[PDB]
């Protein structure tokens, strides 16, 4: 199948330079184009360029003439998006896309890559429990999460119980405190049956700080 | 460059009806080769963007025929019949007829669905946050419709100002519905002060207010 995987989320200071991959499979590489496309945060999606990995020929929207340059890896099925002298404006999650001409559209996109550009330093979470509202001998639900607390900058990863729970999760969006960390709360609801016969462990992934924790929640 | 212009800005919509979503352009997309280069993509909360139209009024592969384009020229439409829960997000069109493509600004679809009433959770801080110096006490309103809800903080039956922070998640893509976190932030010296932390909800699906409470060290 189809499939075009990025890199990791970045934390970068101003002035940096900045380069995110995008590795293609599932298809013939050099048959198709590879456009990278921003999305600044709780913006529209804008169009930065494509680059041929036929000819080699890179093409910039109006925007994204200068310090944009897109590099390719042929053997390695990999395209590239590098960002000279970074700004504040720079502050987006990039997406690469595969370009199909033969109706000139995009068709499979990435997962996409966070950039931060900021003079401030990581700061790995604190993932703290959220201990399950009932016992075991009570009915119906029981709640209960983790509170992955002051962290900089966006994003972490969370999931229970490595991925295999998924069902009645709810991931809050990140709010900022008066210290300018960020915070979050993961919660899951579940049969309060299970409280005494299932453990619950949430994994938390704050890759610009290297930070993975798994926490334990129990009653 | 030519600009696209779509409108609404934001489409609520009942599960079952009819949504459409329009697609301006100030120059005409139709290419001197007789093509019109106008596409839809669909970026679902939290996701990439997914190509759901091309060239006006093919469905991509897997995208269900409830999806159909139309227009030519200038304006082109998407419309969505019986509308279902998963369609929810922010709806894109693309031109590639002119250089350099561009997207119109999206049209966030949200559903309209019956009122749903929140079930309230509290959560005390954790040893292990109190023995690194602060306390969070955390309400969770899991599952409500519609988002607006008024949470109130009460610490030994004292309304709290100023000291929580909330969050939403985006409506669920299966039932559409919302859920909310309040957070109260204390030192362990504050917290310790007091006894009775609770957290008071009021909502339309509420006949009166829903509180729930903890003694700490209970």
């Known amino acids: 199948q189809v499939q075009l995987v990025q890199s990791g989320p970045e934390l970068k200071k101003p002035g940096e330079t900045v380069k995110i991959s995008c590795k293609a499979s599932?298809?013939?590489?050099?048959?198709?184009?590879m456009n990278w496309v921003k999305q600044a945060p709780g913006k529209a999606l804008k169009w930065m360029g494509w680059?041929?990995?036929?000819?080699?020929?890179?093409t910039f929207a109006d925007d994204f003439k200068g310090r944009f340059a897109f590099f390719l890896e042929t053997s390695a099925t990999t395209a590239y998006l590098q960002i000279n002298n970074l700004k504040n404006e720079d502050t987006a999650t990039y997406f690469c896309?595969?370009?199909?001409?033969?109706?000139?559209?995009?068709?499979?996109w990435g997962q996409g890559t966070s950039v931060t550009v900021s003079s401030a330093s990581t700061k790995g979470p604190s993932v703290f429990p959220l201990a399950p509202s009932s016992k075991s001998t009570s009915g119906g639900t029981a709640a209960l999460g983790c509170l992955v607390k002051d962290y900089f900058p966006e994003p972490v990863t969370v999931s229970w119980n490595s991925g295999a729970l998924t069902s009645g999760v709810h991931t809050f969006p990140a709010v900022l405190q008066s210290s300018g960390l960020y915070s979050l709360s993961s919660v899951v609801t579940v049969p309060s049956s299970s409280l005494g016969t299932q453990t619950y462990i949430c994994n938390v992934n704050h890759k610009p700080s290297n930070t993975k924790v798994d926490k334990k929640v129990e009653p | 460059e030519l600009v696209m212009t779509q409108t609404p800005l934001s489409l609520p919509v009942s599960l079952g009806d009819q949504a459409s979503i329009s697609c301006r352009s100030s120059?005409?997309?139709?290419?001197?080769?007789?093509?019109?280069?106008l596409h839809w993509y669909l970026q679902k909360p939290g996701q990439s963007p997914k190509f759901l139209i091309y060239?006006?009024?093919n469905r991509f592969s897997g995208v269900p025929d409830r999806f159909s384009g139309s227009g030519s020229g200038t304006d082109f439409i998407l419309k969505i019949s019986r509308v279902e829960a998963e369609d929810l997000g922010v709806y894109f069109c693309?031109?590639?007829?002119?250089?350099?493509?561009?997207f119109g600004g999206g049209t966030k679809l949200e559903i309209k669905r019956t009122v749903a009433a929140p079930s309230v959770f509290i959560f005390p801080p954790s040893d292990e946050q109190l023995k690194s110096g602060t306390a969070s006490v955390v309400c969770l309103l899991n599952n409500f419709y519609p988002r607006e809800a008024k949470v109130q903080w009460k610490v030994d039956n004292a309304l709290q100002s100023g000291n929580s922070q909330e969050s939403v998640t985006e409506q669920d893509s299966k039932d559409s519905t919302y859920s909310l976190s309040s957070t109260l932030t204390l030192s362990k010296a504050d917290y310790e002060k007091h006894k009775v932390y609770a957290c008071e909800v009021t909502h339309q699906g509420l006949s009166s207010p829903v509180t729930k409470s903890f003694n700490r060290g209970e």
């Open positions: 060239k006006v009024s």
């Open positions: 680059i041929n990995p036929y000819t080699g020929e890179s």
């Open positions: 120059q005409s997309l139709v290419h001197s080769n007789g093509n019109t280069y």
């Open positions: 599932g298809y013939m590489f050099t048959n198709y184009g």
């Open positions: 693309f031109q590639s007829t002119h250089f350099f493509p561009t």
């Open positions: 896309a595969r370009g199909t001409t033969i109706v000139w559209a995009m068709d499979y």
